[model samples]
Target: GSSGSSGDEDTMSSVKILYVRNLMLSTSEEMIEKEFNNIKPGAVERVKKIRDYAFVHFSNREDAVEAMKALNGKVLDGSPIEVTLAKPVDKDSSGPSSG
Candidate 1:
């Protein structure tokens, strides 16, 4: 009973956005979206590119975890990719914590 309850809690608390790193500068959002779409069609909702990484949003937390498990440590265009849960940010909070 304890095992099942803890497992359910863990699943519910999982993240829903996948943070992708080591992406080439030339890698566009479109390319990232396309790749994720191929991997898990209709799972991804949007892709946002930062200076050196991309944040991919999935329809649900489980889909994000699936994408991370399927693509982490994988190579793309000669660069190794790292995927993990995107850190949650407080929109109203500013300053150092925001960064």
Candidate 2:
């Protein structure tokens, strides 16, 4: 049988936000950081999650890129995950995207 190829996605150095979804109903903030910690120790600066989606914040792109590539399509809390680059929320203005 043929094996599947693992295509790693590209990431930008300025990217610090990672949008991850397909989370389990019981997924927690600590759990999200735990997974990221496994990839890049002490790189998980922040974590924000909703019902089935979460945002992972990293201080640097190197750590975020590695985490994104390594953790994408991986399973957590009994659910597969998908991670991608997200818009950087400016610290000056804490406003939602919807207008």
Candidate 3:
């Protein structure tokens, strides 16, 4: 059962992911989404946080870059947000969409 298919979704869908660290313990998904809503539309999809950080996936690469640029050094709740092209969340996941 060998089908020829290159299943790399990053190159196919061009989804850009951002890793936001140093979040306040009280940071809410609605807050993160509202912040991104300030940047651009169709930029942030789902946000999952674990007390200190979260993984945010964008609709596309351009929106991701624009938001990353506008947000990286921005302060929120007495702490600056760390935004970057997210590293592979896992070996099996090429990006958020892959998961």
Winning candidate number (lDDT) = 2
Distance from true location, Cα of 22 in model 2, Å: 0.8
TM-score of 1: 0.72
| Candidate 3 structure quality by residue, lDDT tens digits, 31-51 | 888897789865687788777
- Give the per-residue lDDT digits (tens) of candidate 1, residues 3-86: 545333546354588889989998888888887777778888999998889899988876788778888778887889899987
Per-prediction backbone clash count: 0, 0, 0
| Model 1 ranges with Cα > 4 A deviation | 1-15, 91-99
lDDT of 1: 0.81
Stretches of model 3 off by over 4 angstroms after superposition: 1-13, 89-99
lDDT of 3 at 75: 87
Per-candidate Cα RMSD to the true structure, in Å, reads: 7.4, 11.6, 9.0
Question: In candidate 3, how many clashes are counted?
Answer: 0
Positional deviation of 13 in candidate 3, in angstroms? 6.5
The true-versus-predicted C-alpha distance at residue 15 of model 2, in Å, is: 3.3
How accurate locally is residue 87 in candidate 3, as Cα lDDT from 0 to 100? 63
